[PDB]
Amino acid sequence: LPDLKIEKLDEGVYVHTSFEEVNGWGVVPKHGLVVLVNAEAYLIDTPFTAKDTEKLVTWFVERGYKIKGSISSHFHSDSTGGIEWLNSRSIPTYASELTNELLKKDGKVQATNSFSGVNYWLVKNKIEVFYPGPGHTPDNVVVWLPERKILFGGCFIKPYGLGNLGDANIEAWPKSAKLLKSKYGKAKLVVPSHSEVGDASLLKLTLEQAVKGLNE
Ligand SMILES: [Zn+2]
Ligand SMILES: [Zn+2]
């Protein structure tokens, strides 16, 4: 029910927030980013819906910021809902190969661009994608903005609770979170999907939450 929001987080970096009713969670927020590169926009995750995806695209396009592409952090609809809409307007969509395979098994439209392997530059020296290992889902990836020191951790970053465990790898998550912590300890900001922007400390809190969750 709450409207899409778009707020400036840093130079060239915006957080978009969209909202869905999920059984047994109530209203769930979903943060993505929009990164400006040379005055063009990259979507980091789509909103849940084609409607919120249209609104996000229009906000940037009306202000003279052409959409250059989207990258989806994992296969769940809170990352991928707007792929179909983006494809219908010939905006390049990006996902890992495993994210595309899971999208296809789940009867969902796929990104027109895939990458495999651990590191992938969406835009070299500006938008990097890292796979830390399975956690929230087998396919979850994070997006690093080296220039700003900003990690989009997506649905992997779970600083107060692990959320929906439906597709989770509870065995692997702590090791993944271990690896993520070592690599991005130098993060100025960490943006999770389902709770508010924080600092590097969100890496620790997620490790602790993973260790804790595995213990049961
Ligand atoms: Zn998810
Ligand atoms: Zn999520």
PDB file of C-alpha atoms and ligand atoms in Angstrom:
ATOM      1  CA  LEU A   1       0.000   0.000   0.000  1.00  0.00           C
ATOM      2  CA  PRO A   2       2.750   2.639   0.798  1.00  0.00           C
ATOM      3  CA  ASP A   3       4.056   4.488  -2.333  1.00  0.00           C
ATOM      4  CA  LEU A   4       7.473   3.850  -3.981  1.00  0.00           C
ATOM      5  CA  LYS A   5      10.149   6.129  -2.441  1.00  0.00           C
ATOM      6  CA  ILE A   6      13.422   7.355  -3.999  1.00  0.00           C
ATOM      7  CA  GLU A   7      15.893   9.200  -1.712  1.00  0.00           C
ATOM      8  CA  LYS A   8      19.445  10.427  -2.397  1.00  0.00           C
ATOM      9  CA  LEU A   9      21.913   8.300  -0.317  1.00  0.00           C
ATOM     10  CA  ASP A  10      25.216   9.802  -1.700  1.00  0.00           C
ATOM     11  CA  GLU A  11      26.560  11.447  -4.946  1.00  0.00           C
ATOM     12  CA  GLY A  12      25.097   9.420  -7.882  1.00  0.00           C
ATOM     13  CA  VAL A  13      23.432   6.882  -5.433  1.00  0.00           C
ATOM     14  CA  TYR A  14      19.672   6.657  -4.625  1.00  0.00           C
ATOM     15  CA  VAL A  15      17.707   4.097  -2.543  1.00  0.00           C
ATOM     16  CA  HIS A  16      14.326   3.060  -3.995  1.00  0.00           C
ATOM     17  CA  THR A  17      11.840   1.506  -1.521  1.00  0.00           C
ATOM     18  CA  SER A  18       8.759  -0.498  -2.593  1.00  0.00           C
ATOM     19  CA  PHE A  19       6.325  -2.458  -0.403  1.00  0.00           C
ATOM     20  CA  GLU A  20       4.359  -5.750  -0.589  1.00  0.00           C
ATOM     21  CA  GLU A  21       1.874  -7.615   1.639  1.00  0.00           C
ATOM     22  CA  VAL A  22       3.562 -11.007   2.477  1.00  0.00           C
ATOM     23  CA  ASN A  23       1.603 -13.660   4.544  1.00  0.00           C
ATOM     24  CA  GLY A  24       2.923 -13.843   8.160  1.00  0.00           C
ATOM     25  CA  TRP A  25       5.262 -10.809   7.629  1.00  0.00           C
ATOM     26  CA  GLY A  26       2.681  -8.040   6.974  1.00  0.00           C
ATOM     27  CA  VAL A  27       4.031  -5.028   4.977  1.00  0.00           C
ATOM     28  CA  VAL A  28       7.642  -5.754   3.878  1.00  0.00           C
ATOM     29  CA  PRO A  29       9.863  -2.931   2.561  1.00  0.00           C
ATOM     30  CA  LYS A  30      12.379  -3.655  -0.262  1.00  0.00           C
ATOM     31  CA  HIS A  31      15.388  -1.328  -0.826  1.00  0.00           C
ATOM     32  CA  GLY A  32      17.207  -1.236  -4.150  1.00  0.00           C
ATOM     33  CA  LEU A  33      19.607   1.404  -5.544  1.00  0.00           C
ATOM     34  CA  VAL A  34      19.810   3.576  -8.646  1.00  0.00           C
ATOM     35  CA  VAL A  35      23.478   4.466  -9.459  1.00  0.00           C
ATOM     36  CA  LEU A  36      24.274   7.325 -11.902  1.00  0.00           C
ATOM     37  CA  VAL A  37      27.262   6.667 -14.245  1.00  0.00           C
ATOM     38  CA  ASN A  38      28.023   9.661 -16.565  1.00  0.00           C
ATOM     39  CA  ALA A  39      24.448  10.907 -16.015  1.00  0.00           C
ATOM     40  CA  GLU A  40      22.805   7.507 -16.896  1.00  0.00           C
ATOM     41  CA  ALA A  41      20.939   5.259 -14.410  1.00  0.00           C
ATOM     42  CA  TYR A  42      21.621   1.646 -13.395  1.00  0.00           C
ATOM     43  CA  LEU A  43      18.853  -0.109 -11.367  1.00  0.00           C
ATOM     44  CA  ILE A  44      20.276  -2.314  -8.520  1.00  0.00           C
ATOM     45  CA  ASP A  45      17.256  -4.683  -8.085  1.00  0.00           C
ATOM     46  CA  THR A  46      13.780  -3.918  -9.525  1.00  0.00           C
ATOM     47  CA  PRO A  47      10.773  -3.106  -7.303  1.00  0.00           C
ATOM     48  CA  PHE A  48       8.293  -6.027  -6.700  1.00  0.00           C
ATOM     49  CA  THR A  49       5.978  -4.779  -9.525  1.00  0.00           C
ATOM     50  CA  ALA A  50       5.965  -3.499 -13.113  1.00  0.00           C
ATOM     51  CA  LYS A  51       4.006  -0.507 -11.676  1.00  0.00           C
ATOM     52  CA  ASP A  52       6.804   0.480  -9.205  1.00  0.00           C
ATOM     53  CA  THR A  53       9.446  -0.311 -11.902  1.00  0.00           C
ATOM     54  CA  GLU A  54       7.648   2.061 -14.373  1.00  0.00           C
ATOM     55  CA  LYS A  55       7.491   4.824 -11.638  1.00  0.00           C
ATOM     56  CA  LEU A  56      11.249   4.394 -10.749  1.00  0.00           C
ATOM     57  CA  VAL A  57      12.292   4.475 -14.484  1.00  0.00           C
ATOM     58  CA  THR A  58      10.053   7.535 -15.191  1.00  0.00           C
ATOM     59  CA  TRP A  59      11.434   9.527 -12.184  1.00  0.00           C
ATOM     60  CA  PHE A  60      15.032   9.226 -13.608  1.00  0.00           C
ATOM     61  CA  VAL A  61      14.022   9.409 -17.316  1.00  0.00           C
ATOM     62  CA  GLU A  62      11.901  12.605 -16.809  1.00  0.00           C
ATOM     63  CA  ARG A  63      15.015  14.226 -15.188  1.00  0.00           C
ATOM     64  CA  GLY A  64      17.137  13.369 -18.314  1.00  0.00           C
ATOM     65  CA  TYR A  65      18.767  10.172 -16.828  1.00  0.00           C
ATOM     66  CA  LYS A  66      18.455   7.426 -19.502  1.00  0.00           C
ATOM     67  CA  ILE A  67      18.155   3.931 -17.908  1.00  0.00           C
ATOM     68  CA  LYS A  68      21.303   1.973 -19.026  1.00  0.00           C
ATOM     69  CA  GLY A  69      20.310  -1.340 -17.356  1.00  0.00           C
ATOM     70  CA  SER A  70      19.136  -3.330 -14.291  1.00  0.00           C
ATOM     71  CA  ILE A  71      21.010  -6.021 -12.240  1.00  0.00           C
ATOM     72  CA  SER A  72      18.942  -8.421 -10.043  1.00  0.00           C
ATOM     73  CA  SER A  73      20.701  -9.661  -6.824  1.00  0.00           C
ATOM     74  CA  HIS A  74      18.649 -12.905  -6.729  1.00  0.00           C
ATOM     75  CA  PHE A  75      15.697 -14.738  -8.214  1.00  0.00           C
ATOM     76  CA  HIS A  76      12.975 -13.706  -5.682  1.00  0.00           C
ATOM     77  CA  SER A  77      10.319 -11.301  -7.144  1.00  0.00           C
ATOM     78  CA  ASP A  78      11.457  -8.499  -4.750  1.00  0.00           C
ATOM     79  CA  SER A  79      14.677  -8.346  -6.922  1.00  0.00           C
ATOM     80  CA  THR A  80      13.251  -9.447 -10.337  1.00  0.00           C
ATOM     81  CA  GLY A  81       9.539  -8.384 -10.526  1.00  0.00           C
ATOM     82  CA  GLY A  82      10.216  -5.606 -13.077  1.00  0.00           C
ATOM     83  CA  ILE A  83      12.438  -7.622 -15.488  1.00  0.00           C
ATOM     84  CA  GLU A  84       9.544  -8.347 -17.916  1.00  0.00           C
ATOM     85  CA  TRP A  85       8.601  -4.617 -17.985  1.00  0.00           C
ATOM     86  CA  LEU A  86      12.268  -3.565 -18.418  1.00  0.00           C
ATOM     87  CA  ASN A  87      12.677  -6.132 -21.283  1.00  0.00           C
ATOM     88  CA  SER A  88       9.452  -4.821 -23.006  1.00  0.00           C
ATOM     89  CA  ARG A  89      11.074  -1.289 -23.141  1.00  0.00           C
ATOM     90  CA  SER A  90      14.405  -2.759 -24.416  1.00  0.00           C
ATOM     91  CA  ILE A  91      16.301  -1.820 -21.223  1.00  0.00           C
ATOM     92  CA  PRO A  92      19.147  -4.342 -20.688  1.00  0.00           C
ATOM     93  CA  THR A  93      18.485  -6.656 -17.684  1.00  0.00           C
ATOM     94  CA  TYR A  94      21.385  -8.484 -15.906  1.00  0.00           C
ATOM     95  CA  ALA A  95      21.348 -11.475 -13.522  1.00  0.00           C
ATOM     96  CA  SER A  96      23.852 -14.273 -12.708  1.00  0.00           C
ATOM     97  CA  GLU A  97      23.445 -17.450 -14.844  1.00  0.00           C
ATOM     98  CA  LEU A  98      22.171 -19.306 -11.686  1.00  0.00           C
ATOM     99  CA  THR A  99      19.666 -16.410 -10.997  1.00  0.00           C
ATOM    100  CA  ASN A 100      18.439 -16.880 -14.622  1.00  0.00           C
ATOM    101  CA  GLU A 101      18.180 -20.703 -14.221  1.00  0.00           C
ATOM    102  CA  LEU A 102      16.155 -20.298 -10.954  1.00  0.00           C
ATOM    103  CA  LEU A 103      13.962 -17.568 -12.568  1.00  0.00           C
ATOM    104  CA  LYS A 104      13.232 -20.043 -15.448  1.00  0.00           C
ATOM    105  CA  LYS A 105      12.471 -23.019 -13.104  1.00  0.00           C
ATOM    106  CA  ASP A 106      10.060 -20.623 -11.203  1.00  0.00           C
ATOM    107  CA  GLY A 107       8.201 -19.820 -14.519  1.00  0.00           C
ATOM    108  CA  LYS A 108       9.657 -16.248 -14.584  1.00  0.00           C
ATOM    109  CA  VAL A 109      10.998 -14.071 -17.441  1.00  0.00           C
ATOM    110  CA  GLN A 110      14.872 -14.022 -17.437  1.00  0.00           C
ATOM    111  CA  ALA A 111      17.425 -11.129 -17.679  1.00  0.00           C
ATOM    112  CA  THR A 112      18.678 -10.681 -21.304  1.00  0.00           C
ATOM    113  CA  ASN A 113      22.290 -10.529 -19.907  1.00  0.00           C
ATOM    114  CA  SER A 114      23.914 -13.236 -17.671  1.00  0.00           C
ATOM    115  CA  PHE A 115      27.326 -13.518 -15.953  1.00  0.00           C
ATOM    116  CA  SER A 116      28.916 -16.517 -14.161  1.00  0.00           C
ATOM    117  CA  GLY A 117      31.904 -16.668 -11.821  1.00  0.00           C
ATOM    118  CA  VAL A 118      32.544 -14.854  -8.583  1.00  0.00           C
ATOM    119  CA  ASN A 119      33.431 -11.251  -9.743  1.00  0.00           C
ATOM    120  CA  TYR A 120      31.680  -9.413 -12.696  1.00  0.00           C
ATOM    121  CA  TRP A 121      31.904  -5.711 -13.611  1.00  0.00           C
ATOM    122  CA  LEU A 122      28.527  -4.287 -14.672  1.00  0.00           C
ATOM    123  CA  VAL A 123      30.473  -0.993 -15.162  1.00  0.00           C
ATOM    124  CA  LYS A 124      34.255  -1.404 -14.641  1.00  0.00           C
ATOM    125  CA  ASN A 125      35.629   0.467 -11.544  1.00  0.00           C
ATOM    126  CA  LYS A 126      32.023   1.609 -10.634  1.00  0.00           C
ATOM    127  CA  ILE A 127      29.565  -1.325 -10.280  1.00  0.00           C
ATOM    128  CA  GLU A 128      31.031  -4.721  -9.287  1.00  0.00           C
ATOM    129  CA  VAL A 129      29.012  -7.883  -8.525  1.00  0.00           C
ATOM    130  CA  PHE A 130      30.379 -10.431  -5.995  1.00  0.00           C
ATOM    131  CA  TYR A 131      28.956 -13.901  -5.172  1.00  0.00           C
ATOM    132  CA  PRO A 132      29.908 -14.622  -1.508  1.00  0.00           C
ATOM    133  CA  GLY A 133      28.343 -18.133  -1.524  1.00  0.00           C
ATOM    134  CA  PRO A 134      24.846 -19.460  -0.724  1.00  0.00           C
ATOM    135  CA  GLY A 135      22.846 -17.737   2.086  1.00  0.00           C
ATOM    136  CA  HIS A 136      19.299 -16.285   1.798  1.00  0.00           C
ATOM    137  CA  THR A 137      19.229 -18.200  -1.583  1.00  0.00           C
ATOM    138  CA  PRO A 138      21.753 -20.316  -3.563  1.00  0.00           C
ATOM    139  CA  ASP A 139      22.211 -17.441  -6.111  1.00  0.00           C
ATOM    140  CA  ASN A 140      22.386 -14.285  -3.889  1.00  0.00           C
ATOM    141  CA  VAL A 141      24.959 -11.649  -4.990  1.00  0.00           C
ATOM    142  CA  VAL A 142      25.978  -8.242  -3.666  1.00  0.00           C
ATOM    143  CA  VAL A 143      26.812  -5.124  -5.666  1.00  0.00           C
ATOM    144  CA  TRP A 144      29.859  -3.016  -4.623  1.00  0.00           C
ATOM    145  CA  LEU A 145      30.261   0.715  -5.552  1.00  0.00           C
ATOM    146  CA  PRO A 146      34.074   1.127  -5.039  1.00  0.00           C
ATOM    147  CA  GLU A 147      34.054   4.961  -5.642  1.00  0.00           C
ATOM    148  CA  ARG A 148      31.527   5.611  -2.786  1.00  0.00           C
ATOM    149  CA  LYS A 149      32.433   2.587  -0.571  1.00  0.00           C
ATOM    150  CA  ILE A 150      28.743   1.424  -0.671  1.00  0.00           C
ATOM    151  CA  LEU A 151      27.724  -2.275  -0.559  1.00  0.00           C
ATOM    152  CA  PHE A 152      24.206  -3.228  -1.713  1.00  0.00           C
ATOM    153  CA  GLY A 153      23.934  -6.511   0.247  1.00  0.00           C
ATOM    154  CA  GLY A 154      20.401  -7.320  -0.932  1.00  0.00           C
ATOM    155  CA  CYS A 155      18.478 -10.052   0.910  1.00  0.00           C
ATOM    156  CA  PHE A 156      21.788 -11.660   2.128  1.00  0.00           C
ATOM    157  CA  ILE A 157      22.327  -8.816   4.683  1.00  0.00           C
ATOM    158  CA  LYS A 158      19.985  -9.720   7.603  1.00  0.00           C
ATOM    159  CA  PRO A 159      21.218  -7.743  10.648  1.00  0.00           C
ATOM    160  CA  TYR A 160      18.288  -8.464  13.134  1.00  0.00           C
ATOM    161  CA  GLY A 161      16.756 -11.715  11.714  1.00  0.00           C
ATOM    162  CA  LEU A 162      17.205 -13.956   8.615  1.00  0.00           C
ATOM    163  CA  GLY A 163      13.658 -13.350   7.274  1.00  0.00           C
ATOM    164  CA  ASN A 164      12.125 -15.875   4.795  1.00  0.00           C
ATOM    165  CA  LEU A 165      14.135 -19.160   5.113  1.00  0.00           C
ATOM    166  CA  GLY A 166      12.091 -20.846   2.294  1.00  0.00           C
ATOM    167  CA  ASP A 167      15.052 -21.077  -0.213  1.00  0.00           C
ATOM    168  CA  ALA A 168      17.831 -20.409   2.390  1.00  0.00           C
ATOM    169  CA  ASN A 169      21.080 -22.405   2.830  1.00  0.00           C
ATOM    170  CA  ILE A 170      21.458 -22.192   6.639  1.00  0.00           C
ATOM    171  CA  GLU A 171      24.609 -24.487   6.636  1.00  0.00           C
ATOM    172  CA  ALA A 172      26.520 -22.297   4.100  1.00  0.00           C
ATOM    173  CA  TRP A 173      25.331 -18.794   5.108  1.00  0.00           C
ATOM    174  CA  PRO A 174      27.842 -18.296   7.993  1.00  0.00           C
ATOM    175  CA  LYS A 175      30.838 -19.161   5.714  1.00  0.00           C
ATOM    176  CA  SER A 176      29.380 -16.851   2.956  1.00  0.00           C
ATOM    177  CA  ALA A 177      28.885 -14.069   5.569  1.00  0.00           C
ATOM    178  CA  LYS A 178      32.457 -14.698   6.875  1.00  0.00           C
ATOM    179  CA  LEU A 179      33.792 -14.181   3.283  1.00  0.00           C
ATOM    180  CA  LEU A 180      31.524 -11.080   2.705  1.00  0.00           C
ATOM    181  CA  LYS A 181      32.750  -9.552   6.048  1.00  0.00           C
ATOM    182  CA  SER A 182      36.520  -9.932   5.074  1.00  0.00           C
ATOM    183  CA  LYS A 183      36.029  -8.507   1.538  1.00  0.00           C
ATOM    184  CA  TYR A 184      33.849  -5.424   2.452  1.00  0.00           C
ATOM    185  CA  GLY A 185      34.984  -4.558   6.031  1.00  0.00           C
ATOM    186  CA  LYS A 186      35.982  -1.150   4.472  1.00  0.00           C
ATOM    187  CA  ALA A 187      32.291  -0.348   3.424  1.00  0.00           C
ATOM    188  CA  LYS A 188      31.185   3.236   4.453  1.00  0.00           C
ATOM    189  CA  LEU A 189      27.467   2.204   3.926  1.00  0.00           C
ATOM    190  CA  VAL A 190      25.732  -1.236   3.696  1.00  0.00           C
ATOM    191  CA  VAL A 191      22.180  -1.244   2.125  1.00  0.00           C
ATOM    192  CA  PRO A 192      20.106  -4.372   3.016  1.00  0.00           C
ATOM    193  CA  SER A 193      16.860  -5.277   1.164  1.00  0.00           C
ATOM    194  CA  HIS A 194      14.487  -5.453   4.189  1.00  0.00           C
ATOM    195  CA  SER A 195      16.020  -3.114   6.845  1.00  0.00           C
ATOM    196  CA  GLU A 196      17.594   0.360   6.781  1.00  0.00           C
ATOM    197  CA  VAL A 197      21.051   1.491   5.508  1.00  0.00           C
ATOM    198  CA  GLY A 198      23.832   1.074   8.119  1.00  0.00           C
ATOM    199  CA  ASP A 199      27.654   0.789   8.164  1.00  0.00           C
ATOM    200  CA  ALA A 200      30.200  -2.107   7.995  1.00  0.00           C
ATOM    201  CA  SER A 201      28.729  -3.323  11.388  1.00  0.00           C
ATOM    202  CA  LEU A 202      25.753  -4.808   9.382  1.00  0.00           C
ATOM    203  CA  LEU A 203      28.313  -7.394   8.011  1.00  0.00           C
ATOM    204  CA  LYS A 204      29.143  -8.564  11.594  1.00  0.00           C
ATOM    205  CA  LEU A 205      25.425  -8.512  12.665  1.00  0.00           C
ATOM    206  CA  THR A 206      24.534 -10.714   9.579  1.00  0.00           C
ATOM    207  CA  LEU A 207      27.372 -13.219  10.376  1.00  0.00           C
ATOM    208  CA  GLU A 208      26.077 -13.392  14.026  1.00  0.00           C
ATOM    209  CA  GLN A 209      22.460 -13.860  12.766  1.00  0.00           C
ATOM    210  CA  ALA A 210      23.638 -16.650  10.380  1.00  0.00           C
ATOM    211  CA  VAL A 211      25.690 -18.473  13.129  1.00  0.00           C
ATOM    212  CA  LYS A 212      22.631 -18.054  15.455  1.00  0.00           C
ATOM    213  CA  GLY A 213      20.087 -19.356  12.868  1.00  0.00           C
ATOM    214  CA  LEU A 214      22.223 -22.442  12.006  1.00  0.00           C
ATOM    215  CA  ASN A 215      22.476 -23.254  15.775  1.00  0.00           C
ATOM    216  CA  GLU A 216      18.705 -24.039  15.401  1.00  0.00           C
TER     217      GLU A 216
HETATM  218 ZN    ZN B   1      14.689 -13.229  -1.358  1.00  0.00          ZN
HETATM  219 ZN    ZN B   2      14.126 -10.147  -0.123  1.00  0.00          ZN
END
